[PDB]
Symmetry: D2
């Protein structure tokens, strides 16, 4: 079930472009097409349907797996890529422009094949599978994003998890590169595609200085902006301060910011009261998963006029007469107003993704009520695969250097 099966030829060129820029995932595909480690394994995945998800899902099929795919976000599907995937053997039930009903119809669709492994992005598939008492034949799962692992850890503290799950988000090759480097470029890209706004002179307010937010602040600063950071963590506010960024409350930032981007995993982090004090022409965007970081509800009630300027650009006139610009319906603007993270960075996360599924199948003595970090050996193999593909040589410790480091005394 896709939007237009006629775009598969244009979409196929997009997956090959992504393949040529995912050398590490292509190297794993070769061991997969040779040892077929996922033979007879049925995978249910709710992921962002991109050209990069296509390289991972088709790499898993090369390992002998049967995959059912559903979009992780109702506006994230690249329609051409979904067409190209259907023309192959991928049971893809997703298209851009879904409604909330279509979203869960597509999730029930991927679930009729009765999967052994559950691959999820924001936590919805793990929640639905548990809330409707499936889980029976499920051997394990993986979680791709920060918000999904928090839901999964809450599930695990409640003794509700029924299969072991790998938090691929917690791998060094993921959150240090996907969340930071990838979202830094992608979020700015989405802002520029939805609006051709000048970054140079503007006061940009980044709410959240976690891995996503510090990458956004870095690239706003690299684009010439005056960066303001709002944080609730004492540690991360001091990090942003010592990195040269003005740190303050949203109450103060509400009056100065020209662009506000949210990168929390939290609710109404930009609230209706905040928006009332904002300047005329202020642009709002969200980079966390789920459209609840900005009070989009409040903005619609305090508003007396809405209109679309263009794709992903919505204008709201408040009673005070001032105009507020919402980007991408408050959904993660990188994947909705643009294409998400580059193919080169998703190479790393989808290498942990692919290898963590092989690890889940190869094992079955794991705890069905436990959230796992990626095994450091898999984490390290991904890094060596990327360096190998990039032609970067690293120093090898000498024997005298390995000896000196085990030592605590001296050497007369």
């Amino acid at each position: 079930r896709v939007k237009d099966l006629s775009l598969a030829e244009q979409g196929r060129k997009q997956i090959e472009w992504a393949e040529l820029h995912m050398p590490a995932l292509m190297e794993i595909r070769k061991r997969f097409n040779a040892e077929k480690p996922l033979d007879g394994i049925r995978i249910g995945a709710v992921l962002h349907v991109t050209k990069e998800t296509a390289v991972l899902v088709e790499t898993l099929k090369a390992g002998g797996a049967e995959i059912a795919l559903a979009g992780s976000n109702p506006l994230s599907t690249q329609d051409d890529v979904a067409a190209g995937l259907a023309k192959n053997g991928i049971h893809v039930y997703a298209w851009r422009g879904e409604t909330e009903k279509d979203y869960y119809d597509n999730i029930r669709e991927i679930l009729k094949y009765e999967p052994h492994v559950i691959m999820d992005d924001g936590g919805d598939l793990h929640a639905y599978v548990h809330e409707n008492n499936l889980t029976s034949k499920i051997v394990g799962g993986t979680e791709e994003t920060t918000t999904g692992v928090i839901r999964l850890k809450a599930m695990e503290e409640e003794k509700v998890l029924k299969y072991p799950v790998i938090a691929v988000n917690n791998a060094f090759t993921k959150y240090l590169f996907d969340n930071r480097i990838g979202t830094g470029q992608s979020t700015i890209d989405g802002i520029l595609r939805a609006t051709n706004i000048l970054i140079a002179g503007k006061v940009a307010v980044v709410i959240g200085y976690g891995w996503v937010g510090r990458g956004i602040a870095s690239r706003f600063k690299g684009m010439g902006a005056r960066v303001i950071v709002v944080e609730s963590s004492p540690f991360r506010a001091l990090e942003a301060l010592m990195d040269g960024f003005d740190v303050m409350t949203m109450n103060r930032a509400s009056e100065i910011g020209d662009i506000f981007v949210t990168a929390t995993g939290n609710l109404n982090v930009v609230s209706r009261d905040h928006i009332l004090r904002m300047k005329d022409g202020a642009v709002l965007a969200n980079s966390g998963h789920f459209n609840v970081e900005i009070d989009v509800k409040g903005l619609k009630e305090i508003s007396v006029e809405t209109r679309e300027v263009r794709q992903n650009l919505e204008e709201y006139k408040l009673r005070n007469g001032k105009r507020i610009y919402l980007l991408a319906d408050g959904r993660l603007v990188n994947l909705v107003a643009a294409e998400g993270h580059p193919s080169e960075v998703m190479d790393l996360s989808f290498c942990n993704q692919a290898l963590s599924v092989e690890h889940l199948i190869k094992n079955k003595g794991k705890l069905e009520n436990k959230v796992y970090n990626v095994p450091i050996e898999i984490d390290e193999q991904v890094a060596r695969l990327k360096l190998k593909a990039l032609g970067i040589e690293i120093e090898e410790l000498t024997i005298e250097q390995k000896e000196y480091i085990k030592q605590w005394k001296y050497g007369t």
Copy 2:
């Protein structure tokens, strides 16, 4: 003569978007709509048909002028903006996808109105009127880009220039922001729209360290890239070196680079021989005017296979089998793969444009053989308008301070 007038409503929404972010040009429109300084003046323009050129030409029409507009590059025209301009009173002969005959047909159309003022971007319109012996009724003109000013300075050395022309490119409020800050964002934006390539880990080669090239290198570096500069000027190469960038010849850079962007006003700075030595997957883009900085004709002859991967992304197979990616067919990647400079920066550039046409009509005792710089009084009013629009106060010198600096003797 445009592509589809059915887009006039969407394009109008784009021009209104530009209007709100070009506040300094809007305040000039107010004094223009009241004093009608260009009443009875007919203007012929070769500019990039964008939402920002739309705000400039309609600002000119408010001053009482009749305007004929033709596209400056055959792929830069925004079709909806061209439609919206047709719904108003602008005689626009341009559309995306033109041919060289269509380009010069649209220029001959512009010349039927017997223009009083000639507004040009790349110098193509000024050259035509002189080479085809029109210019009879022309009172003056303006030049927007570095390439056009060089030609007009060459035209003036041969005493073929027939009217005074203002080098709007040379105004401080233009080349310091349009050429540097504007192209820096725009070119990265165009690169990211034609390819979703990660800039962070890459070796980016910028050929040309003028105002355009240093803005591009700054933004490559701000996006995380390893920047290499190729320069032919000893001064600007030493500047690029002291700005922390690796400086070398194209022969050395060609074997190392992942992305090559050209920003000269010159010919074959990325040559046939350079591409033969480049890595597999190297991306080529041009930011200067005219498609001759990269030898695109040579690339077609050393190629055995060509293919379009996506809009504005052409793939070439070489005899060695290595693939070379060309962006926007070697045309300005900012204006062809994206939307050009933000409206906020073109506000500064088009304030000189509008004020320089008013300056040409108020005067008539200028040299019909001279390229002029923008009058410094106008140059300083543009910056004061932006600051007044942005809410930035500057310090005013006290009288003891103004006197101290006219003094040179012993004692203060």
Copy 3:
């Protein structure tokens, strides 16, 4: 025992300057002078004898402790600060220019008072006390730097450690600001004081991309240098690559670098054979603790001439005829060629020291052979104290926000 007790007035002005720039440590001092949590406690300390160490030990004296202090490095001691510290009640055995025999004689001196708590900087005091069986009355200790933590953990896996030790280096408020921010500024400052070298156009090689090396690379880049990273960890090599730095082996960097700075906890990281490959004029510096990161013993044997150019700058002429400049005899150049970390950054590290030393006395039911990280409560109190002192307001999470974070169930 200090060099000249007559400088006690000059040192006092230096210690008072630090007090004004360690505001968070002063509020701990006020709560110490009132609650005297360290009554009847004798402390033996091996630390860098600086104005900031003076503010910490006197904060310890105010809490009712008796302190014996010995220098952590034979060239780090500020003699006036030691004089000023002796004029009060601090048993300080240290001066600049010490011999290695003086170093270990001074350690027996502070160890004569039979301390209950051991404060060590590079691990030397923890080792001596253990190899010579003086742990009998020692109730606990603290460790300040990464190299000391590695030694203590080796003692811990080797099960010889005899008291609990708090790894103060591993606190977020320590390694994120002290190791990263402080050493970045301090090392560049030391390089500039021993040489007024131009950083801008130069190739600077940072060996080690941990917290110290990334801070050094950040400040080299900010001072205009072209930064090259050498690393042995695949994770950290990819971290350096994605941050825009060329990553290679020492074998390649040795022939291209102008400045070499070491930031490993390791031995012979810049070897005898690397220096023979270096260019005429290359500068060598070390920022990790202990002067064994640069093969300075090897450099002296392959050299034919050595001479002092100025304070902390020794020039060596090689058999090749080329000149190699060594800074501060390969000892930590930040603390030897300059004054170490600013007072504002050591405020954070020495707040952890005081609060974690008080924590060692508050308890006594802790495990022998156990290295602990700083309790997360104290780590956060240090962070909140700095924010309060800097006047920085942090955002407060609402009740609806704390609820949405525990949920994993469907419905928004």
Copy 4:
């Protein structure tokens, strides 16, 4: 006449250090010692007596010139370098700690040899020579700094100037590197030597966004500070805003800034009323020539108690009780609290110096009443000499490329 002739050995090691780091000036010295272009010429110079002036002054002696040297600033002289110069053949009258009477006594000393050439830094020697009716035997002169060029240009408008003067400050290889890159590092180095202040977390105010101030802002930003710019020109305030810096008046910046550095050529730019509004602990420093940018005379009259904390750091207690720290007594902090610009950058400025003196001797048909910019041929030789010494290759323009640049017509 110097302070201590016994320091001549330490100074010579410092001049040798500069010679090894001024390769381009070392290349001119050999052409000078061979072609003796300045034989029989007497030169009187008022410059900062540094290891870098020593390399230039001895380079002039190598060309056959007789040189008398006096310090340009009473606290800038490097005493060991002055001793080393006196042991050679340099009539040097300078020492650190001069009084204003000593300053002009020393200028009369160097003026007793009746020089044909005047080398000046801040304009004082040009002013004295004109105000006391000498100039009789003077054949020409040079000006090194911006402040001197303004005074000399007023002398030209007043028709008082009696010999031709070369504005060495206005050459690209000077103001693009000395004023910007050199002073940027130099000023931060001086601040760090007078105080070990953390730059990272601080608000730094740069008053003046010319070539000096923008270099200082670049280095504050590179050291992690939050940079605020105060400007009086609309053009440069817009330059500072688009470079990402908060721009405001001194009245607003005075209440926010932690460090204030002045880089104007102007008077009372930091006023007494401004200082009373400042935070407690604010640091003041000056980078423009002459100690009048900060109202230091006003600050001494508003204070109730003053004391020196360390070299170049005085603490002032204000009537409101707040503490204000002044650096280098309001004088160039780069040259008084540190060692001025690195030798690699002064290589460029003193190469223009050396080459422009010979150009003054080669000629005598220049208007003996006019200020000239450095001849473009010499500016270009300086750039190529530096590029060759650094091993940097620049691209050579093709014969086809040289033609395409003079063409203007349609096609070819």
